[PDB]
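Dear Dr. K.,

Following up on our conversation at the group meeting, I've run the structure prediction for acyl-coa dehydrogenase from Advenella mimigardefordensis dpn7. I'm pasting the input sequence below exactly as I used it, so you can double-check it against your construct before we proceed with anything downstream. Let me know if the numbering doesn't match what you have in your notebook.
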Amino acid sequence: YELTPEQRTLQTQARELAQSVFASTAVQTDLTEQYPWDNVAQLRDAGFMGMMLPTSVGGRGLSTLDTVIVIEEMAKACATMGRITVDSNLGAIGAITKYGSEEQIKLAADLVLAGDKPAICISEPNAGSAASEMTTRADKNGDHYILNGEKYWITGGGVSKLHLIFARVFDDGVEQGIGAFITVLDDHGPEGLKVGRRLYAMGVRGIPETHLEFHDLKIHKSMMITFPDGLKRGFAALMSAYNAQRVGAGAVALGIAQCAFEEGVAYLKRREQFGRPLAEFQGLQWMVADMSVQLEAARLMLRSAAVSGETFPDINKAAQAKIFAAETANKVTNDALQFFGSSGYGRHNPMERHVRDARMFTIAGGTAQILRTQVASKILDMKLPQTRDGY
Ligand SMILES: Cc1cc2nc3c(=O)[nH]c(=O)nc-3n(C[C@H](O)[C@H](O)[C@H](O)COP(=O)(O)OP(=O)(O)OC[C@H]3O[C@@H](n4cnc5c(N)ncnc54)[C@H](O)[C@@H]3O)c2cc1C
Ligand SMILES: CC(C)(COP(=O)(O)OP(=O)(O)OC[C@H]1O[C@@H](n2cnc3c(N)ncnc32)[C@H](O)[C@@H]1OP(=O)(O)O)[C@@H](O)C(=O)NCCC(=O)NCCS
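The predicted structure tokens came back this morning:
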């Protein structure tokens, strides 16, 4: 239940980069809401991008746990850098690594290792929790697929090059299921791929969340992730790669909470009222005790989930960890802010940002409610349909 000597080294390397470079840019990144290109370049040069890619394509061949360790250190410095580390190591790049062809893996690897944070494109304005109800379609046309539809809250929209787009595949009018399509966005850009309006967010403002439109987007069949056993199971396998994403997302939430925790504790020791430091008040001591307990548990849950499953973490262990970590983060950041008092409410301190940044993680990548349903389906060992006629 402890890190290996190699993992401490990886942790130290991650912490050094985050504290000496990223930490001093967190406040401004939140102010400008601008994608930190400079920081991403340093993140790449330190080998913290595409870590789970095989060594045969330039990757380090690391584990999910390795990334989770790195991700948390980045998040403790900057929530934006935390999420970037996630998307550039887990999720879309994970599904491509596992299910993609040699050509598709090489294209994805070259981009990520060059410093590109991939963008996954699943959610639609009328299809969030019910992702299987997405209206983005891909009609087959010869050896190509014509994509028409819209996505939103696309993390990295406008700055991401690599795109993994999920769409309902139709063959001569007949539905085939949902498949994933790879496309790359550049200055010249692919015809039909349009970056929609930006959705300005409560926190983690350093990464643009945008709408995304597809107007007769022509994708060759060599850029569709294919399966020998049909797309019907294909849509069930791509989201299994998202089980690793959730653990990473949980690590970001944990990182934010841990930072706020450390800052709150440090403040209690130096801030004095009634002739003494705040740390000498029992009620505040127990609050500190409560936070440390939940943080320790959260870190255990995340790390435990990371080493579970086969290629990706177990879907339910990951769901349990994500629920715990995200909800833990919301309480810790809020209570840590309370330690600062009035100054905690001031934007000249980072405490109010911590609450704003942490708030998204009970929502994005599957809400805490949808994850509870998932966990319940495991314990009860039954399907839990949400439709009116699912029984
Ligand atoms: C910061 C951020 C970044 C994001 N980045 C991306 C990205 O990169 N790619 C991407 O594809 N998507 C992204 N999303 C979207 C997100 O992954 C989905 O939208 C998420 O599943 C939430 O969907 P929704 O907002 O449509 O929730 P809705 O489906 O509108 O749910 C609304 C509320 O109803 C509850 N609810 C819904 N269905 C049920 C049910 N059956 N039972 C009980 N309760 C229910 C939910 O818990 C939620 O609280 C991002 C979102 C955020 C906030
Ligand atoms: C899965 C979800 C869409 C509900 O779907 P549903 O209508 O209950 O359909 P079911 O879960 O019964 O079936 C879907 C299949 O995909 C599989 N699946 C779904 N999510 C999965 C995940 N995260 N990991 C692995 N497998 C998954 C299920 O095992 C199931 O396979 P089966 O056919 O062998 O049973 C919803 O609970 C969910 O998790 N979505 C959250 C939104 C989201 O993920 N958005 C990401 C964008 S950031």
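Two things stood out to me. The chain has 14 helices and nine strands. Residues 74 and 271 are 28 Å apart (CA to CA).

Best regards,
J.T.
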